[PDB]
């Protein structure tokens, strides 16, 4: 009672039901380094301007 698979059937992506637990860290990755914290707050004008040599603005 064996039916030969039709053209296009053996190349299907199928689903598999397994009792094997899904691996957590398959790449064996280290802990990722913490990022630089953030930019936060409101933008205030520069204190006493550019503060270049003699420029008051």
């Amino acid at each position: 009672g064996w039916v030969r698979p039709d053209l296009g059937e053996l190349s299907k992506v199928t689903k598999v039901k397994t009792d094997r637990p899904l691996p957590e860290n398959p790449y064996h990755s280290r802990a990722r380094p913490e990022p630089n914290p953030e930019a936060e707050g409101d933008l205030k004008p520069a204190k006493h301007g550019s503060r270049l040599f003699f420029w008051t603005m």
Binding site: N36, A39, K47, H48, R51
Partner: protein
Amino acid sequence: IARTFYDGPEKNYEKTMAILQIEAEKAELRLKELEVRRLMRARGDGPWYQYPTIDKALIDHSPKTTPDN
């Protein structure tokens, strides 16, 4: 002459005080700014001197014809 062409000593005195305060604050700001630049360039933990790396969104996380990546 004093009444017509000049002001009292208080005006110049307190204008000098304001000018001195502004100048001293600018000096301390300049020194602090140099120190902050040095620390940020040495450690790289600040918003400045942030040199580009590779964007992680370019990585393709799909099966690769071979199980071992």
